[PDB]
DNA sequence: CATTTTTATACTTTTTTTACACCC
DNA sequence: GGGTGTAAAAAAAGTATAAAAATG
């Protein structure tokens, strides 16, 4: 039916204008003013498309794109005040699908929106032990009943699974789960790795899928 | 592992530019000088991506896109010297996946190519392995195998093995490698190297007493083979 | 209230130290 | 005998888990 579009934008005027324009084209519109709320709404609302303004202060748009790409393949169209090539390349390599420099023609945006939308196999499941993981749907089934992970736990699991077979350093896991401002706190990582092992391993005391690489970091297997 | 990009372009300057851009980050280039030739090769050569210049004189590029879209869903990125948005909208509605207007940089072009290609051509190619005897080493994944089984190395052992692997055949002095494994403060502690090379030897060699890959250069340092 | 962060303590791995055999 | 290879300790660094305090 109607396409669900999530708009992460801090400027009120642009939010209203875009809401008018996109609702006029027959799309259900959701907005977020911050990146964290935008990620939250991305998880809960499951939009078919995300418009993201890089001019958001509270965090980093690239960080948003990466965090989102840890589990979601939803098309992301970025709008920006800058038109510097380095920013385009960075955003696109982070996982963005398109880039527009402000100001732009609304018709062009509608066009690229249609292009992004019309590009749409079931979700890849990761199976190990008796656990079934669906990253795209953010659901995990141990055995046959759903097991609940907290936001940090799920992000950690997503990072580990996306790098299946490869060991990740504590710096990497911390940077990708908590962020750049908390890379000295390896104990966070120990604790939450503990949570994951507790919830998912058949024997939390002796892991067979969430392996400790002593002195380095951690690694998911199978 | 190569991406087959077909460029539809007649002007030699832009074609040169596109060739340097495409060969820039490891791709293969098919060329077509007319729209008809473009369709023909689009079918016969099965490109992973088509870069199409709308500046082509032989006909309408948008109708090229419409004709192509009747039997192919290959990504097409459209180039243009104009920037009138109606042309953009027409091209995108026609079936194009992206639209670049002058002036386009080589970097942004390459980036957008990567974007258009990572939808289908993304299959996660296995990490490159370093092999000798029945030992397998994945530097990226930080995992070592010996036979079917997995061999665990401690961090220092791994740093050492990595440095040795990077310098296969070359003779390393104890000083310059102590400066690379431990650091610039244990440069005289040449006893650590002995016991730890002993660890690499008994962990990896078939006969740890008679090393085939971890050879010692008495007086100067060590040297790794294979 | 669920969740994250701080706090405290038992535990395991790795590094360094220190020891005794080697060998042309 | 200077330079080199196994083995075992003592020392240092790193890890697991619980549980209370803080966050919003």
């Amino acid at each position: 039916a109607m396409a669900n579009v999530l708009i992460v934008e801090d400027e009120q005027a642009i939010r209203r204008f875009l809401r008018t324009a996109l609702e006029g084209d027959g799309m259900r519109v959701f907005e977020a003013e911050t990146l964290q709320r935008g990620l939250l709404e991305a998880a809960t609302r499951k939009p078919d498309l995300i418009i993201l303004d890089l001019g958001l202060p509270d965090g980093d748009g690239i960080e948003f794109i990466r965090d989102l790409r840890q589990w979601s393949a939803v098309p992301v169209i970025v709008l920006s005040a800058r038109s510097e090539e380095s920013d385009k390349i960075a955003a696109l390599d982070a996982g963005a699908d398109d880039y527009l420099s402000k100001p732009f023609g609304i018709g062009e945006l509608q066009a690229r929106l249609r292009v992004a939308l019309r590009r749409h196999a079931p979700d890849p499941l990761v199976k190990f032990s008796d656990v079934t993981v669906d990253l795209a749907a953010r659901v995990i089934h141990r055995g046959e009943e759903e097991v609940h992970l907290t936001p940090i736990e799920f992000r950690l699991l997503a990072v580990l699974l996306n790098n299946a077979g490869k060991v990740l350093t504590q710096r990497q896991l911390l940077n990708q789960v908590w962020g750049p401002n908390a890379v000295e706190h390896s104990h966070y990582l120990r604790i939450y790795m503990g949570h994951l092992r507790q919830k998912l391993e058949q024997d939390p005391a002796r892991p067979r899928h969430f392996i400790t690489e002593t002195g380095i970091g951690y690694r998911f297997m199978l």
Side-chain angles (χ1 to χ4, degrees), chain A:
Chain A
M2 309 185 68
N4 286 13
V5 176
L6 170 56
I7 300 178
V8 188
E9 174 78 79
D10 66 320
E11 281 145 329
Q12 212 160 92
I14 309 185
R15 290 203 304 273
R16 290 196 181 94
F17 169 66
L18 283 183
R19 176 171 284 279
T20 296
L22 297 202
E23 283 186 352
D25 264 32
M27 299 169 181
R28 190 172 296 101
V29 177
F30 305 94
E31 337 133 340
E33 303 178 4
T34 68
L35 295 177
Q36 55 136 10
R37 188 58 174 264
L39 285 172
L40 237 301
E41 299 295 334
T44 70
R45 306 280 169 170
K46 296 295 199 307
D48 306 324
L49 182 51
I50 297 183
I51 300 177
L52 167 70
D53 196 310
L54 277 200
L56 256 70
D58 64 275
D60 184 25
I62 272 70
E63 197 234 343
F64 176 92
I65 297 181
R66 300 195 168 279
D67 294 346
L68 176 66
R69 282 293 177 253
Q70 296 288 0
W71 65 272
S72 178
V74 63
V76 170
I77 298 186
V78 171
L79 311 181
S80 177
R82 292 170 167 263
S83 63
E84 337 297 334
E85 193 178 15
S86 64
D87 189 23
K88 289 186 179 176
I89 299 176
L92 291 184
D93 288 341
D97 301 78
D98 209 326
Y99 193 109
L100 282 84
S101 298
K102 294 185 292 181
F104 47 81
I106 186 62
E108 180 183 0
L109 177 58
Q110 304 279 19
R112 300 187 173 275
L113 243 60
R114 296 189 294 275
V115 171
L117 289 188
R118 69 168 176 259
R119 285 198 237 94
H120 54 21
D123 300 328
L125 302 191
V126 171
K127 302 193 206 66
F128 59 97
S129 175
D130 61 325
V131 184
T132 298
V133 185
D134 189 344
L135 285 190
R138 302 180 63 91
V139 290
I140 301 93
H141 300 295
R142 184 174 181 178
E144 60 281 351
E145 65 259 11
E146 189 165 339
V147 28
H148 173 82
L149 294 177
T150 73
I152 287 186
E153 290 170 348
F154 179 84
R155 181 166 299 185
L156 181 55
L157 175 76
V159 176
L160 288 175
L161 257 58
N162 290 337
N163 302 271
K166 312 154 68 68
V167 347
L168 291 177
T169 63
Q170 300 169 3
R171 178 165 319 279
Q172 284 180 301
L173 284 175
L174 284 175
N175 188 269
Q176 296 194 44
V177 177
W178 280 266
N181 301 124
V183 193
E184 57 278 55
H185 316 90
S186 303
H187 53 288
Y188 290 9
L189 188 57
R190 297 192 187 99
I191 291 179
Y192 277 91
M193 202 62 56
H195 290 18
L196 274 180
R197 277 161 171 170
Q198 171 61 33
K199 296 190 185 181
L200 300 177
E201 283 286 348
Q202 191 154 353
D203 196 342
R206 52 188 84 186
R208 300 181 64 91
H209 293 103
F210 296 90
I211 279 75
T212 299
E213 293 296 316
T214 317
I216 301 305
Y218 297 90
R219 155 165 136 260
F220 173 76
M221 288 195 55
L222 284 71

